[model samples]
Target chain A: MKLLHIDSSILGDNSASRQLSREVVEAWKAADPSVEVVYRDLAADAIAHFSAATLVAAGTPEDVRDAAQAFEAKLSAETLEEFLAADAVVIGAPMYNFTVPTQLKAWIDRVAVAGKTFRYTEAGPQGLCGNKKVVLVSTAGGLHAGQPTGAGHEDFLKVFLGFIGITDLEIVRAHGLAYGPEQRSQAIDAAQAQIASELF
Target chain B: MKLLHIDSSILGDNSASRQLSREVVEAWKAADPSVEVVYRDLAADAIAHFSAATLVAAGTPEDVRDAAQAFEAKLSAETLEEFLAADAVVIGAPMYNFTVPTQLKAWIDRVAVAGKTFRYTEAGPQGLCGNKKVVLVSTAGGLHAGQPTGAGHEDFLKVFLGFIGITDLEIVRAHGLAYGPEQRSQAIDAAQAQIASELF
Candidate 1:
């Protein structure tokens, strides 16, 4: 089995999502010793946001594309291919301003390609990647679950994942990290315990 | 009065939000001729996503910051300053996969600073940008104004703006662009009419 691990927190070691996601991956690998993992640290090596240049790169013929266009196309292709090849994905998504970090959003833009991950039918839109499982490690400064504050964070992730047809999803949350040191510790500990006992 | 105009559509001239946002700015200018406009094309010259290096840049003393750190710091400072200086802002935000474009989100990350845009009071979080007026020119490919599909796109924008204490908000929507040419034209026309007649 292949697992793709994505981390998008800027807080390096201080990030609850990063720490929890690492443990989640470790436990998953422990449960299946044959699992192979591919890691992407979006904060360290960010994906460029999808732009006009990206569209040009995708549409332009390979031989005719400029160096910049070629690089953009290659990056998009490789990012999408890695996602398609993965049987499971672990996303460590930390909330920034009531939303997922822009680094993670950039990655999502690359993979959410038309005719690739989704397609439009006469009936409506249809998702193609139903075979994959997704584990979202969500961390936020405030308690936002089931609140309007969560619409852009966890809820957005669920909407995007569901639109792409991935129904086998699990969310491990660590919220209220900014509440205080004690609350932060308790949040992280609870998330870690959930990861260790129930995830595998 | 000063107005900040932000365009985040990768579609350039083909974007409904761009056309509508431009109209909104023009109408605002017409309403108040003294309004100075500072434009930021988020798609053309995208802001880098906030990262670990960004936090380092913010924390590092100016004299000791390395070249990369200095650049990051400067970018964040300028972006935030531009936002702070504006009395009004026109955001040309196109919905890409049920959310604002990544470029726009990156800009938001830079400006939504702690103690700058918002602060923690003994009574919880309080916004500091209550004086600013925001006009969000929202465009999407599907009909999602009040549905769950709109949660991450239009609803997210409202939540973010409200969190920052910008209550005087206006939304010019052009949705169902992918429905058909007639619907797209109708939507754009209606949005444009709203901009011309009601935005200012």
Candidate 2:
């Protein structure tokens, strides 16, 4: 099996999400020593935000009469290709405020191409990429678990990933890390254990 | 009154959200020339991701014996104070993939401090800041309006703000921009008109 491991946090080594993701990858490695894992750290090599040139490249139809339009839109072709080749994708994302980080979002912009990741149907939008597993390893500062103030970051990820056609998913969250070091330790340990028991 | 305008798009001047936010601010300025607008392009002036030292500073009791801990924690304090001082805040956030941009999330992490933004009361979590007007201007590539996927991003912002005590909020969405250039123009025009009529 092949795995695409993505760490989006800018904190790198100091990131709690990185720590949890390391455990996830290690367990995966332990379970299947032969499994191939591809690592992409977005912080080290930041993805470019979508530009008009890039958008034109992604949107223009290849069979269209306008040759100039087709040329401008070809930049995203490589990224789209990479996304289609991945098997299971694991993302280590920390909730920034109430959403994913920009680096990660840039990658999303690259992958969420029409007719690639999703398509608009007569009924509604339909996801094209399916029959794959996606694991989101996340860390949060406060417990936005069930409280009215907590924005339910986990639920958002689930729905968003579902929109892109990956319904089989799991979330390992390390929350309340900002509360104190003790709580932070507990959150990381708990997330690591969950990854080991359920994922490994 | 002073308005703090923050744009997170890496698209720079050509970003649809930036154009929309500019239109909104322009309308606001026309309505009240006295309102000073302080702009912060987060992509340009990126804030540091939360660190363990910074977290320790924020979580430690103010009266704690450790002086270094208190000083490190002051970063969050300064952030909270800045937020409290702003009369109104205008944010141009483009949805990356299915969530918020990480840069904006970093700003949220700074301001969404417990005890400062919200507190655990016997009744429940109550927001500390109240009556502040926040206008979240967002642009999405597809039509997620009224769908399960669409609700997550909006709900996350609404719930997080409510937790911190900012209830009077307005969300102006410019979705389906990625459909085509014509569609993008129409969407921008409609959003701009809405901002003129409702926001200003």
Candidate 3:
């Protein structure tokens, strides 16, 4: 089995999502030693924000494309390849300002290519890609899950992933991290417990 | 009054949100011609996705900073300055996969600078930036607004801006754009009406 492990937190060792993702991946991998892992530190190796250059480069013939456009086109194709090749994807998505970081969003834009990941059909819209499982571990400063503020990252992920045909998704979250000591520890432990129960 | 006009759509002239934003800005300008506009086309001139280089450049001493680090640091500083100097910030944020485009999110990562936008408090987190209002014109391919799917871009923008203490936020959205021609035209008209009535 092939697995894609994506970490988007800028904090190297201090990120709660990263710790949870590591534990999740460990449990999943240890369950099957034959798994092949592809790791991406999104914050370290950032993807380009989608632009006109990307579209032009990808659409234009190779001979006519400029260096910048060609670069973006190649980058997008490579990102798409990574996502398509993965059997199981694990994302360490740290919520920043009530949403997923730009790093993760850039990756999504690359992977959610029309006609590649999804297609428009007569019976409304249909998701072409499916059958793969996704584990998204999210961490937030404050608890937005049941709060009046709501969870933008979780909600967005649920809808967007479902739209792309991946409804077999699971989320392990550690929030209220700003609540300090006991709350933070409890949140982390709960997420790890959830991850273990789901994947074990 | 000073205004920061941000266009994050990858599409140039063909972008629907761009069309809406132009009309909105025109209406806003007509309300008062003396409005000084500082335009930043995020897609045209994309900001770097937050990375270790960004942090190193900003926090590192100038004399020891590498050329690449220094450049990113300068770019982040400039982005923050532009956001801070404006009395009003208008963003043309088209939904890409149920959320704001990566370009807009990248800009937010830069400007949502800690200490400049918000700070940790003894009681809890408090916003340092306030009073400035935000007007976001969003365009969506499918209708997520008023649905169970919900509009992640709108929700993210609301909470993120509110986190920075910009509570007087307004959004003019044109959704179901890819549904058909009639929906596109009607949505555009409704969004224009909203913008005209609210801002004007």
Q: Pick the candidate with the highest TM-score.
A: 1
Best by lDDT: 1
Q: Compare candidates 2 and 3 on TM-score and give the better one.
A: 3
Compose the digit string of candidate 2's lDDT tens values, residues B129-175.
Answer: 78678899988988876665664566777767876888778888899
Model 3 spans > 4 angstroms off: A148-150
Flag regions of model 2 displaced more than 4 Å. Answer: A12-14, A52-80, A121-124, A146-152, A179-186, B7-20, B39-85, B101-132, B139-147, B173-197
How well is each residue in A82-131 modelled by candidate 3, as lDDT tens digits?
98989898999887767888889889889988788888777777776687
Q: Give per-model TM-scores.
A: 0.98, 0.70, 0.93
RMSD of 2: 6.9
Q: In candidate 3, which residue pairs get closer than 3 Å at backbone N, Cα or C atoms, i.e. clash?
A: none
Instruction: Give DockQ per model, in order.
Output: 0.83, 0.28, 0.65
Candidate achieving the largest DockQ: 1
lDDT of 2 by residue, A35-122 (tens): 7888888767666555444555555667862765554455356656666777778888887656666567667767887677898887
What is candidate 1's lDDT per residue for B27-91, written digit by digit as tens? 88889989999999999999988888888899999999999999999999999999999999999
Interface RMSD of each: 0.8, 4.2, 1.6
DockQ of 1: 0.83
Candidate 2 Cα lDDT to native: 0.75
